Amino acid sequence: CGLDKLKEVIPENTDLVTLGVRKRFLEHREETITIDRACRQETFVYEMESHAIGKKPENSADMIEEGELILSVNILYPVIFHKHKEHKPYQTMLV
DNA sequence: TTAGTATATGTGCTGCCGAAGTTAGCACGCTTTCCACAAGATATATAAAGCCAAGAAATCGAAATACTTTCAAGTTA
């Protein structure tokens, strides 16, 4: 179980299944998507997840003890949104 | 035969609670059977329309996609 014996290189020249979908997506990207952008919500999620990576408290007494319950709670307050798009109305919190 | 005793003799006492009767003057005001006589419940046109419930077709309601708009960030300049 090492990395020196593990496959950067173009993922091709092997009998695969998902690689066909991957190449189709690459072609669809080269068609209209330009460089690496238009991923607004994607970068939002990325940064909002990185904001909580390895941040230490200002005081030593504010260290979260091991095993503390973290609960994810979505909230739907507003009516002003897409009732059509599967429903994505409002923010989600952690407590 | 006569004095002592038990009884009933009607009598006379006590309470016994109740009995009739009282309280003043106007103006307002259901069951068994048994029973018998006649009335369900019966075919049958019959024209007529209104009603009350299975089916068949129709269209309304709206849900999952297809167009256009719209930004917003990024391109040739």
From Swiss-Prot:
Self-association and partners: Part of the SNAPc complex composed of 5 subunits: SNAPC1, SNAPC2, SNAPC3, SNAPC4 and SNAPC5. SNAPC3 interacts with SNAPC1.
Function text: Part of the SNAPc complex required for the transcription of both RNA polymerase II and III small-nuclear RNA genes. Binds to the proximal sequence element (PSE), a non-TATA-box basal promoter element common to these 2 types of genes. Recruits TBP and BRF2 to the U6 snRNA TATA box.
Coiled-coil segments on the chain, per record: none
Localization in the cell: Nucleus
Domain of life: Eukaryota
Family to which the UniProt record says this protein belongs: Belongs to the SNAPC3/SRD2 family.
Record's protein name: snRNA-activating protein complex subunit 3
